[PDB]
Amino acid sequence: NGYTYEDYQDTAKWLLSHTEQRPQVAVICGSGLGGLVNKLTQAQTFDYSEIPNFPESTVPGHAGRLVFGILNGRACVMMQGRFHMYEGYPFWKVTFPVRVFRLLGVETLVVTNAAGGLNPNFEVGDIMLIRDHINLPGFSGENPLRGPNEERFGVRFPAMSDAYDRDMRQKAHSTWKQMGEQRELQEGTYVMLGGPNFETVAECRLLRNLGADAVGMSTVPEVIVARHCGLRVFGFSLITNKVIMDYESQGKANHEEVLEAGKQAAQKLEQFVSLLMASI
Numbered sequence: 206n207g208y209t210y211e212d213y214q215d216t217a218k219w220l221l222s223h224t225e226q227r228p229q230v231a232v233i234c235g236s237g238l239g240g241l242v243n244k245l246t247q248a249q250t251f252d253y254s255e256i257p258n259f260p261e262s263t264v265p266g267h268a269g270r271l272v273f274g275i276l277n278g279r280a281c282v283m284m285q286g287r288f289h290m291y292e293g294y295p296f297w298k299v300t301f302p303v304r305v306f307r308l309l310g311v312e313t314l315v316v317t318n319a320a321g322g323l324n325p326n327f328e329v330g331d332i333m334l335i336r337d338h339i340n341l342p343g344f345s346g347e348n349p350l351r352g353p354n355e356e357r358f359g360v361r362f363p364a365m366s367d368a369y370d371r372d373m374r375q376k377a378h379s380t381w382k383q384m385g386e387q388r389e390l391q392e393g394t395y396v397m398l399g400g401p402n403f404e405t406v407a408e409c410r411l412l413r414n415l416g417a418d419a420v421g422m423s424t425v426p427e428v429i430v431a432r433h434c435g436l437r438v439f440g441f442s443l444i445t446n447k448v449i450m451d452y453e454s455q456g457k458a459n460h461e462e463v464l465e466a467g468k469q470a471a472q473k474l475e476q477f478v479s480l481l482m483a484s485i
């Protein structure tokens with residue numbers, strides 16, 4: 206790390222004193238998913254740049270704003286845009302907001318992201334509930350929890366086998382049924398790698414063989430820090446593109462189309478998330 210416990214406190218107290226909102230839920234909006242803040246009522250926005258100690262969103266499709274508001278009668282705070290290791294941020298910076306949210310009184314964290322589909326049965330536009338994850342950078346020691354442990358947040362060796370709340374994923378499926386959607390709510394394992402380049406065909410095949418259903422360059426570190434500090438976690442990936450799996454294909458992954466997919470699914474995702482508020 207690099208932040209002191211007081212640093213998180215300072216930031217939390219700053220927010221608590223600049224808004225009347227008191228969120229119980231925090232939502233992290235991934236690439237092209239900033240539209241999830243659109244239906245919040247009594248909304249109050251803070252650019253990340255005005256919040257002490259907050260990193261900056263430099264990726265297109267990430268507004269870089271913290272939006273407090275009410276969603277379906279639930280007080281929430283949304284990260285309209287997030288941070289990634291490939292931007293040059295160590296995980297202790299990428300996940301700074303998560304601990305701030307805990308110090309604000311938040312109890313649940315909803316993580317979302319745009320991801321490449323590895324499961325051949327996935328189609329662009331699909332919503333995949335994250336049932337589990339594979340932390341590749343963690344295998345190497347790249348972890349937000351690396352270094353002295355802050356007992357005021359959590360224990361030295363947190364368990365991750367139950368990271369994605371079982372109860373919330375049951376409600377997610379029940380709720381999806383109420384939406385009367387054409388496609389079924391997908392569910393699977395999200396694997397995180399560093400980026401920023403998109404994967405090669407050989408890497409794609411290997412990742413699928415590891416048992417991964419979707420691939421991305423975010424989320425996992427946020428989930429680890431969330432669980433460490435006691436937050437209930439729920440999340441999903443919007444399958445924005447199908448990773449190229451063969452050498453005969455003329456396709457090629459690109460951020461522009463990833464952002465387009467997010468816009469086309471934004472509406473359906475908003476309703477789903479809003480409906481879910483009632484479940485929390």
Ligand SMILES: O=c1[nH]cnc2c([C@@H]3N[C@H](CO)[C@@H](O)[C@H]3O)c[nH]c12
Pocket residue numbers: 236289318319320321322400403404420421422423445446447448458459460463
């Ligand atoms: O096929 C993919 N591989 C790796 N990342 C992504 C993404 C996510 N969106 C960004 C790039 O489109 C980046 O932050 C990554 O986490 C979408 N599709 C893919």
Ligand SMILES: [Mg+2]
Pocket residue numbers: 247248249
């Ligand atoms: Mg206001």
